[PDB]
Amino acid sequence: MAMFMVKNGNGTACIMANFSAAFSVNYDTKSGPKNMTFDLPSDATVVLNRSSCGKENTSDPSLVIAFGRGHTLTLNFTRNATRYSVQLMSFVYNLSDTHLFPNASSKEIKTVESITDIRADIDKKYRCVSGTQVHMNNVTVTLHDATIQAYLSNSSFSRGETRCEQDR
């Protein structure tokens, strides 16, 4: 149904998302500061044990995507009676991955976080074709051709949509 899905106990999707993510990472190298661009690979998968549909009093919905050599992109959701959003986007990247980060002077696992402008009405999906930008420390994450929805009661996207301001 979607590229990334988080399923509830009864096998029904609670979060569904499509997008192609473009990253830009300024990292510290032995010969200076370097910029690195890459996409979220076509083989990135949903981490089932870290993804959540929410737990009473304990947690809120999350989509955790694992990619490459020890990296994760997380989308944490929040809501009120009528609206919902990705309240926090987390990017965890292993600087010891020599494919994305060659000559890196640090082999540290970096974690960056930011509030996103990804928001939609409840029972509508967020839609952004031109791409939504998330600026974190040294990181820019652009989600292209995005369709994201949380608080789903079915394994299907609602017909209603809340378009991003960038599209118009």
Partner: protein
């Protein structure tokens, strides 16, 4: 296993406030809103408002804002609907509904009856009535009363009338049945009236 269990019936004096509850289970409480809907013979179905438990964000209808107050408690998965300045027009069955906004996934509670009246809980007096046989259930408050025939054996031809409000603020009804004229001597008839509000249980055998 979605379940919404509403509090029991209430009898409220005019001008008083009432607070009805709705306990949820079988689903993630913070994944949906809880809506409240009034069902009355006078105004049919009316959306009152909804509350997002977890934040407490509550949109109200134009008619019920101020009049109704919705609260939520995530520790016990329970929602509350408080109503102020009670008047006769507030007598109705109030439903709690688990939904976000799409009614395709709405689950309805069993309802809670609120009777607004200054009368006191009084038990009914059971008087007796092809032949037609029955029994009159007079001067009782509040609704409802349950009437069965032959401990539930006699169901065909039974007509239990909707109660009517008398000038005294008390209710009165009749439950009748049409049985063949031959079966009068042989089969005897028992009407079983149960007024749970006053814990009254009266069994009445009907004969001439």
């Amino acid at each position: 296993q979605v379940q919404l269990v509403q509090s029991g019936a209430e009898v409220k004096k005019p001008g008083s406030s009432v607070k009805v509850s709705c306990k949820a289970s079988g689903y993630i409480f913070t994944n949906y809103n809880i809506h409240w809907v009034k069902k009355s013979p006078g105004q049919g179905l009316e959306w009152i408002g909804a509350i997002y438990p977890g934040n407490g964000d509550a949109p109200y209808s134009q008619k019920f804002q101020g009049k109704a107050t919705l609260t939520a408690d995530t520790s016990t998965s329970t929602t509350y609907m408080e109503l102020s300045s009670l008047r006769s027009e507030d007598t109705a069955v109030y439903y709690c509904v688990r939904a976000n906004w799409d009614v395709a996934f709405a689950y309805w509670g069993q309802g809670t009856l609120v009777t607004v009246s200054s009368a006191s809980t009084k038990g009914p007096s059971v008087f007796p009535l092809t032949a037609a046989l029955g029994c009159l259930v007079k001067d009782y408050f509040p609704e409802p009363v349950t009437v069965s025939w032959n401990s539930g054996a006699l169901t065909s031809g039974v007509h239990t009338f909707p109660a009517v409000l008398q000038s005294s603020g008390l209710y009165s009804l009749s439950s009748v049945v049409t049985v063949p004229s031959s079966s009068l001597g042989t089969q005897t008839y028992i009407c079983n009236v149960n007024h749970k509000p006053s814990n009254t249980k009266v069994d009445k055998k009907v004969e001439p």
